């Protein structure tokens, strides 16, 4: 491979004209507009690019060595927290190690298993999603048992599809390799099509469930777009023709919907969302003992877009809600619906400097809360009177989630972090006062010893003076003496927190090469609440990029990493982050760049699939004042001819409907046009398996792709196997 040998890429004469508040009419050539399309010319181009990328990777014998190490690092048994259904049995997911989809197991006995005996010794298969299609073309993307434990609803996607289909089966009818060989599927004839972008919410009478669906579309009808969502109700044992439309809004075709049902059967809740801002409406209906019927009466409790409201529970007409209303770090309020003018009060007040991330009601009257303080989760138990009783797992450092059912006398915590593979803790209210908290299961990994790795948090300063924390992970033999390479990962938007997580592949890379992993908590994320998001959003989105570039500069200046040896990686918004960072940062700031499925055409993102929802994140290119801050940031529109680019390996999936791949296609074509003689390769990989909505790749392909990515980075930074 050598510079200047990129595929022949036609440049059209297409020009789009935008309105700028400061400059008036702005003509913007789009010579690669044709890469938005699906044609034989595009297929020739993608094939040529993918062949070039693979030819380059074929030169690197270390990639196969990394595949071997990475596959081994993933080859350990994995499991979820178990859930106790109303049949008395416990159900949990189990992966033997390298299965592409984990398998839902049910306890042999109606008692909590001793999991030290082994999953197959204490449980039998209930639902194996790998058998949904013999060829692996179908995946289970979401599931939900009914409250009575009698039924299991499950959403299935297929390769090539843009929606999921919900099926229902009795909990007494397993789906396994044995059951398929021995008889018919076992499911009911119910087939609930066109499901997308909501949860499955059973009514507490177990008669049916709420789900969001879209209009049916014939193959050649319409465009690839999801509009005119409907919140619907499906009664078990019926066809979809009988489903009830609970809510839709023809006046606002872009809005989407969610629902919840109170444990006591009294209330149905409707949430409405207009964009990706964390603002929502909240309406409340009273259900009578007959449950959901047509013609529901909504009380419009929250009827303007101003804040995030999510129901926790209710006691009678007193509804407990997690909200950021006048509280950017979140809090719990009560809204008392027995009043005509609801009374609103703080139950758990906002903490100025810790985000309230999750609250669940447990054992009927208690509350379990997770606070994210300095991007590290803390777990607390609260009484019915709102008294903080105790901190649970006080020495845990990482990310935590709660799993429970309110009526039950236990809850679980799932705990993980950079060196914590996955611990499931149990709190049992029936146990003696000092014996209530225990460890149910700890994930045991393969080859790696998590104790060999350390994570710390350091603080650096961005351009504008803001102090930003950053996690640094290392194998403990690695010194911060200005010699290590660094992989710096980010997302940087949508109030998504860049939380600790366990990755055996990353740890294997760190140990193999003596490298460090860096995760800066840049603005645009949610780590410090709404104000942190607002600090990198719309007109302040540039701050996200400044924060990410400053992190890389800090790693080198302060001797965590060697000059030229910071590589960057991110996906979706994180791919935008990577692509904009390499355009904007001083030459030589980065040694390698891997944007995955990234946004890059910030002038047209709102014209494809669900991109209009991101106007709350990026601004609206059609508004002149907003064009003026978008255009200078858009990576496709800011490539220069005079800056050396780091080695770059862009990766996309051809079927991606979240971020259409034209973003990356235009970006790579623009790079290759502007700096064809760049000294470092500028390459793109294009996976041509068209994943259905919500579907993942097979494990073997994920391992192969990880080896290509991390091997590319290692070679670009000059790292050798030692």
């Amino acid at each position: 491979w050598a510079p200047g040998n990129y595929p022949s890429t036609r440049r059209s004469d297409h020009v789009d004209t935008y309105q700028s508040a400061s400059k008036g009419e702005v003509p913007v050539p789009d010579p690669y507009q044709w890469l938005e399309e699906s044609t034989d010319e595009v297929d020739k181009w993608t094939t040529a690019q993918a062949d070039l990328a693979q030819s380059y990777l074929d030169q690197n014998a270390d990639i196969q060595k990394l595949a071997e190490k990475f596959r081994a690092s993933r080859n350990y048994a994995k499991f979820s927290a178990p859930t106790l259904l109303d049949d008395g049995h416990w159900y949990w997911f189990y992966n033997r190690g390298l299965q592409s989809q984990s398998v839902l197991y049910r306890s042999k006995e109606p008692a909590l298993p001793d999991f030290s005996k082994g999953d197959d010794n204490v449980g039998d298969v209930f639902f194996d999603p790998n058998v949904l299609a013999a060829d692996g073309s179908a995946g289970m993307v979401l599931c939900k048992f009914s409250p009575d434990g009698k039924f299991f609803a499950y959403a299935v996607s297929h390769l090539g599809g843009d929606y999921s289909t919900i099926y229902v089966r009795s909990t007494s009818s397993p789906l396994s390799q044995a059951s398929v060989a021995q008889g018919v599927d076992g499911r009911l004839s119910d087939e609930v099509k066109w499901f997308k972008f909501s949860t499955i919410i059973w009514t507490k009478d177990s008669k049916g469930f709420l789900y969001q669906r879209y209009p049916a579309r014939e193959r050649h009808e319409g465009t690839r777009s999801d509009r005119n969502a409907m919140m619907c109700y499906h009664k078990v044992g019926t066809t979809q023709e009988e489903d009830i439309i609970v809510y839709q809004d023809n006046e606002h075709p872009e809005w989407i919907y969610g629902a919840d049902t109170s444990e006591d059967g009294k209330y149905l809740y409707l949430y409405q969302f207009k964009d990706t801002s964390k603002k929502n409406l909240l309406w409340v209906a009273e259900l009578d003992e007959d449950g959901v019927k047509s013609g529901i009466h909504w009380r419009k409790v929250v009827n303007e877009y101003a804040a995030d409201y999510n129901i926790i529970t209710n006691h009678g007409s007193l509804v407990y809600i997690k909200t950021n209303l006048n509280a950017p770090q979140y809090k719990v309020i009560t809204i008392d619906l027995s009043k005509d003018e609801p009374e609103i009060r703080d139950f758990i007040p906002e903490e100025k400097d810790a985000k309230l991330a999750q609250v669940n009601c447990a054992n009927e009257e208690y509350f379990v809360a997770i606070y994210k303080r300095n991007v590290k989760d803390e777990i607390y138990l609260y009484s019915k009177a709102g008294v903080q009783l105790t901190r649970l797992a006080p020495d845990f450092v990482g990310a935590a989630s709660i799993a429970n059912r309110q009526k039950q006398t236990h809850f679980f915590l799932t705990l993980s972090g950079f060196n914590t593979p996955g611990t499931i803790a149990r709190y049992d209210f029936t146990a003696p006062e000092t014996q209530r908290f225990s460890i149910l299961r700890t994930t045991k990994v393969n080859e790696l010893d998590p104790d060999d790795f350390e994570s710390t948090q350091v603080w650096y300063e961005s351009k504008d003076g803001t102090k930003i924390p950053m996690f640094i992970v290392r194998h403990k033999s690695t010194k911060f003496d200005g010699t290590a390479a660094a992989i710096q990962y980010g997302y940087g938007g949508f109030a998504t927190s860049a939380d600790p997580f366990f990755s055996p592949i990353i740890l294997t890379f760190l140990q193999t090469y003596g490298a460090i992993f860096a995760v800066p908590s840049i603005r645009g994320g949610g780590e410090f609440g709404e104000e942190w998001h607002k600090g990198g959003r719309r007109e302040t989105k540039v701050n996200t990029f400044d924060d990410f570039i400053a992190a890389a500069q800090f790693l080198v200046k302060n001797k965590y990493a060697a000059p030229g040896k910071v590589a960057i990686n991110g996906a979706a918004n994180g791919g935008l982050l990577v692509m904009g960072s390499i355009v904007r940062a001083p030459e030589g700031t980065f040694g390698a760049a891997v944007p995955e499925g990234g946004v890059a055409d910030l002038l047209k993102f709102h014209k494809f699939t669900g991109g209009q929802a991101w106007i709350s994140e990026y601004g609206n290119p059609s508004i002149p004042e907003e064009f003026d801050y978008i255009y200078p940031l858009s990576p496709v529109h800011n490539v220069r001819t005079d800056k050396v680019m780091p080695a770059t390996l862009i990766t996309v999936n051809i079927g991606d409907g979240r971020v259409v791949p034209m973003h990356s296609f235009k970006f790579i074509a623009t790079l290759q046009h502007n700096v064809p003689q760049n000294p470092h390769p500028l390459l793109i990989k294009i996976d041509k398996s068209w994943l259905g909505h919500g579907m993942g790749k097979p494990t073997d392909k994920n391992v192969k792709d990880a080896a290509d990515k991390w091997g590319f980075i290692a070679r670009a930074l000059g790292l050798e196997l030692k």
């Binding site: 993933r74 994995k78 499991f79 979820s80 927290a81 178990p82 859930t83 259904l85 159900y91 949990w92 997911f93 189990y94 992966n95 984990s102 599931c143 939900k144 048992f145 009914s146 409250p147 434990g149 949860t199 989630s401 709660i402 799993a403 059912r405 799932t414 993980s416 996955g422 499931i424 994930t443 997302y491 998504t496 927190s497 860049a498 939380d499 997580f501 366990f502 990755s503 592949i505 996906a571 995955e596 993942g696 790749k697 994920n702 990880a706």
Partner: peptide, 17 residues
Amino acid sequence: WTAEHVDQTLASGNDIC
């Protein structure tokens, strides 16, 4: 945040009933 890069089995039973 980590959909493709991290196995999600650990959290997959957090909200199934």
